[PDB]
């Protein structure tokens, strides 16, 4: 029962830091005076070990403590959170974490793994542990109406707009056909991170980034030079991810349900999440 | 035949609509057949079958499934119970007809929870609900977890909310906030209704409640005077679902064709059509 859980750096839901002199992570606790449970995840820097915490951290913990399962964290190769490509053709094959869970590099994924139809024909996906949608974060004193602005729709090389390479914000902007002005656009400009591309905004770089509204309002609550708009257009959810001959899968989602009814995803959502 | 799947729902508008045959023995228009069981009196299990026409924004559901996995069924409404309790440890409602194989499946706003999770398999959900807040426009107010609902008495004056009892939502409170519920019991309401008219005429400072309902409501209340919170202080975020039988071969098409219809934009059309208001 020693599960690989693969994850993702991507705050507030996984921070990564580095390891103290001696190989542990430092003992911290939160602004209202919870204990910050830390594990050590292993990842890119060859590998090395780092300190794992947050939200999606605190979740496998309440996950592999009602269940009963030892666990082993790390992040993800190649950074990215997976979608379907043709090899060189004839074959396809998932690259991310998605490509980490099916290959048998990774027994789980704990993430804030968005739920989608091209993802769960060959994955199971829990129940969802944070319902959300997609926003677009832009610099304070851009103006756009949202993905129906003008700027959005009919696209040119003065207002450039992107989000995350090989993510579920790519697959929705790519499988409809009816989005291909916009998707051809964002292909020449998408970033291989959010982080980076949160920092394009902020550098005046990039001028819209379209992502996850649970990531996006957080960091317009953190840096106040940034904001969201339009609201949502997109209502997804985020879910553990797991292959389709998982024992756990039954016991994940009842678990995952009673922590909504409980109040414990709302102790996590005002951890991590909330802020002004 | 294996094609052929029974379906139960429940009349609950706008999710399901049930009027009565064309007055060309046929139902026309945007409805399906559905056929209900009609009790002789109220003091008989004696009743006839009574054919009906099915509308709504879980029909459409129900019918785009149908065209997408590529299964014909046998539409009919349940009688004994609502969504589903579990009464002298048998399960009624939409819930009993699937857990005692009854229904192939269940179509209707039915609350993705834990407890019915242990003898049902749920889709994933199609709209997402859980425990809001409405108030009058210009009330602040974050959600359940403010302090001016657990700790009413530390505010001058203090708020005025309730909800309607023997419901998920009192439950809810009261296992989780204990005092908010003891609280509680002074201002509750008889219905959805009641509460509406409380919030409008300044006997009540809030309502607590289903969240995919009170955005219904708020967005068609008369003037736009009655405003629900932010959905990301909705607490315990769940969804309606579709439940099927414990091991169903159908939960797994079901799942992709949902999903489908939620990256489609179908889904956003049927809210617009359905649930969406003036406000
Ligand atoms: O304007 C109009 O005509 C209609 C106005 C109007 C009022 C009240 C209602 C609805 C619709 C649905 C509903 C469902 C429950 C209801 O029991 N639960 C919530 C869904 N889920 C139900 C369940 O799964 O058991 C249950 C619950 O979870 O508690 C209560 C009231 C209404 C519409």
């Known amino acids: 029962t020693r599960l690989k859980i693969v994850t993702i750096h991507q705050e507030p839901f996984v921070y990564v830091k580095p390891t103290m002199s001696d190989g542990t992570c430092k003992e911290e606790f939160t602004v209202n005076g919870d204990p910050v449970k830390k594990v050590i995840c292993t990842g890119p820097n060859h590998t090395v070990p780092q300190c794992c915490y947050g939200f999606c951290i605190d979740l496998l913990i309440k996950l592999a403590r009602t269940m009963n399962f030892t666990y082993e ?204 | 035949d294996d094609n052929h799947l029974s379906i139960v729902t429940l009349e609950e508008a706008p999710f399901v609509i049930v009027e009565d045959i064309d007055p060309t023995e046929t139902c026309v228009r945007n409805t399906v057949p559905c056929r209900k069981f009609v009790k002789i009196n109220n003091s008989t299990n004696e009743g006839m079958n009574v054919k009906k026409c099915c509308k709504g924004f879980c029909i459409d559901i129900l019918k785009k499934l149908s065209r997408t996995v590529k299964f014909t069924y046998d539409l009919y409404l349940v009688t004994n119970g609502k969504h589903g309790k579990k009464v002298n440890n048998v399960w009624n409602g939409m819930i009993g007809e699937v857990v005692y194989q009854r229904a192939v499946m269940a179509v209707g706003s039915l609350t993705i929870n834990e407890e019915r999770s242990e003898v049902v398999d749920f889709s994933v959900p199609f709209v997402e609900t859980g425990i809001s807040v409405m108030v009058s426009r210009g009330t602040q107010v974050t959600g359940l977890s403010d302090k001016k609902f657990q700790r009413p008495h530390d505010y001058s004056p203090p708020f005025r909310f309730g909800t309607v009892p023997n419901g998920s939502t009192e439950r809810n409170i009261r296992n989780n906030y204990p005092y908010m519920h003891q609280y509680m019991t002074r201002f509750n309401q008889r219905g959805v209704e009641d509460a509406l008219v409380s919030l409008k005429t300044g006997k009540l400072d809030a309502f607590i409640y289903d969240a995919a309902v009170l955005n219904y409501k708020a967005g068609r209340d008369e003037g736009c005077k009655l405003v629900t919170i932010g959905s990301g202080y909705i607490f315990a975020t769940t969804g309606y679902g579709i439940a099927l039988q414990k091991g169903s071969p159908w939960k797994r098409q079901i799942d992709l064709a949902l999903l489908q219809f939620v990256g489609d934009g179908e889904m956003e059309e049927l809210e617009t059509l359905w649930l969406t208001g003036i406000c």
């Open chain 1, 73 to 276: 964290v790390h992040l993800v190769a190649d950074g990215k959170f997976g979608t379907q490509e043709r090899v060189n053709s004839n074959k396809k094959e998932w690259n991310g974490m998605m490509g980490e869970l099916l290959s048998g590099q990774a027994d789980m994924i704990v993430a804030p793994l968005t739920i989608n139809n091209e993802r769960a024909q060959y994955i199971e996906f829990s129940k969802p542990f944070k319902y959300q949608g997609l926003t677009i974060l832009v610099k304070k004193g851009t103006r756009i109406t949202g993905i129906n602005d003008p700027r959005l729709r009919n696209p040119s090389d003065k207002f450039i707009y992107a989000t995350v390479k090989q993510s579920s914000v790519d697959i929705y902007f790519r499988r409809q056909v009816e989005l291909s002005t916009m998707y051809r656009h964002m292909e020449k400009h998408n970033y291989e991170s959010a982080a980076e591309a949160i920092q394009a905004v902020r550098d005046n770089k990039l001028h819209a980034f379209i992502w996850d509204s649970a990531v996006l309002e957080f960091e317009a609550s953190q840096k106040c030079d940034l904001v969201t708009t339009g609201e949502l257009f997109f209502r997804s959810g985020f879910g553990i991810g797991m292959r389709k001959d998982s024992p756990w899968k039954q016991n994940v989602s009842l678990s995952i349900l009673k922590s909504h009814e409980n109040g414990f995803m709302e102790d996590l959502d005002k951890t991590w999440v909330r802020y002004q």
